[PDB]
C-alpha cells in the first residue's frame, strides 16, 4: 500500500474537480447514502488526495440536503428519511446551502 | 541541481496535480511551503503539484 499524502485545505476548484471526477466515474451518482459509505469516501479522499474530511457536509432538515462546501456539486435527494446522492451542475454556480442556511456563514 | 524520484505510484483527480509511477524522476518548480510542491516529470515532461513525501533525493535511497 502507498502511504498517506500531506494535508492541504479544500478549495472551490478542488471541490469542483472532484465533483466532476466522481460524476465521470459514475459510481457515486445515484447511490443510496449511509454514514459508513460517506466515511468510506471521505477516507479515500483524505488518504489519497490529502483533503481533510470536514468538507463533504450537507444541510439538515427533511427534504433535499444541499452541500455546504461551494463547488461540491452533489446533493442528497430523498427517494421513498432515506437519501440518494444526486449530481447537480447548478450547485457549482449556486450556493443553495448559504441561501437556505446563511447562519453557517 | 536537485532531483527527486517517485518512491510510489500516485494518480490525481484534480487537473493541477501530477499523476506518476514509481521511478518517474522530477525537477522541482515550487517549494513555496505547501507540502504539495510543483514539479516536472522527466518521463512525460508535464508540470503540476505532487505530494512531497512521495519523492526522495537521487542521492539517498
From Swiss-Prot, chain A:
Motif interval(s): PxxP: 3-6
Whole-protein coverage range: 74 to 207 of 210
Protein known as: C-terminal core protein
Span list, region Mediates dimerization, Nef-PTE1 interaction: 39-55
Superkingdom of the organism of origin: Viruses
Mutagenesis / variant outcome for changing residue 2 to T: Complete loss of viral replication. Incapacity to trigger cellular activation, probably due to reduced interaction with the TCR environment
Renumbered residue ranges of the record's region SH3-binding: 1-9
